[PDB]
From Swiss-Prot:
Coiled coil: none annotated. Changing V8C: Causes formation of an artifactual disulfide bond with PSEN1. It comes from Homo sapiens. The chain holds residues 688 to 705 of 770 of the full protein. The gene is APP. This is P3(40). The record marks F3, F4 as: Cleavage. The record marks G17 as: Implicated in free radical propagation. Changing A5G: In AD1; Flemish mutation; increases the solubility of processed amyloid-beta peptides and increases the stability of peptide oligomers. It comes from the Eukaryota.
Amino acid sequence: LVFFAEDVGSNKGAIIGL
């Protein structure tokens, strides 16, 4: 429904590294 629940799996920590 949203994007947070999906984004929380990677977030800044993973999106910055990867």
